[PDB]
């Protein structure tokens, strides 16, 4: 669908703000980019693309 991409753009738009990224710890108690989004933010994003899909469909239907 269309949602496919709305996914990939918000997922990336999310890694612009740290407070969405999970944190990981190195050898010496130091914080470092985990490489993951907090379950709830990803949760919302998924929840969005779906809706955006139920958009260009509940609307792509202009005859």
């Amino acid at each position: 669908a269309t949602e496919t991409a709305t996914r990939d753009q918000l997922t990336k738009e999310a890694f612009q703000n740290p407070d969405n990224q999970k944190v990981n710890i190195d050898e010496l108690g130091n914080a470092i980019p985990s490489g993951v989004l907090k379950d709830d933010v990803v949760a919302n994003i998924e929840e969005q693309a779906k809706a955006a899909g139920e958009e260009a469909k509940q609307q792509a239907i202009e005859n």
């Binding site: 407070d19 944190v23 379950d39």
Partner: protein, 183 residues
């Protein structure tokens, strides 16, 4: 011509040259040194119960378990007395490092209930690596039982005993995190 014997009340805190009395809370294998005076000149220390505690020929003490116990100081002129080590509320113990999921498992549901805990241990005993059992370590980062809030984001926060260093929102699956239990 010897003098009454006696183990000085205040205790020495190996971990931070701060002289005072034993803390209500304990960092397992923490270490405080006892002081004797009068009678003979030599001094021999021993501990009632070995599990709960230990001490070398010098007064340096290592708590190795939870409970109460007594230290006997005997002077070379057969003069002996006891110093009582009374149990703490809780005594932090360090198990193996692992994901919060199992941290909470390892430590049978007993993980620090909040940051307001280990902080005390530090404020009190100091940097874990100061003590024998540790020292050869530069890092100890602890799990802190995630609050429903940070539960949803699938994470929790930490504290590094050897360094404090509070880290919020941590991958509840990051490696290099010790599972500190609380007895």
């Amino acid at each position: 011509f010897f003098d009454e014997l006696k183990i000085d009340n205040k205790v020495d805190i190996i971990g931070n040259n701060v002289r005072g009395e034993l803390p209500n809370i304990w960092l397992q294998y923490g270490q405080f040194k006892l002081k004797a005076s009068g009678g003979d000149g030599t001094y021999s220390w021993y501990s009632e119960n070995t599990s709960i505690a230990t001490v070398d020929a010098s007064g340096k003490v290592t708590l190795n378990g939870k409970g109460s116990v007594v230290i006997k100081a005997t002077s070379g002129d057969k003069q002996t007395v006891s110093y009582t080590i009374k149990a703490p509320s809780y005594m932090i113990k360090v198990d193996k490092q692992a994901y919060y999921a199992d941290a909470m498992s390892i430590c049978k549901n007993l993980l620090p209930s909040t940051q307001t805990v280990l902080s005390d241990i530090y404020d009190s005993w100091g940097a874990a690596n100061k003590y024998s059992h540790y020292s050869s370590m530069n890092s100890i980062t602890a799990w802190i039982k995630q609050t429903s809030s940070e539960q949803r984001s699938g994470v929790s926060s930490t504290y590094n005993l050897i360094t404090q260093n509070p880290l919020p929102g941590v991958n509840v699956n990051t490696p290099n995190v010790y599972a500190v239990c609380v007895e």
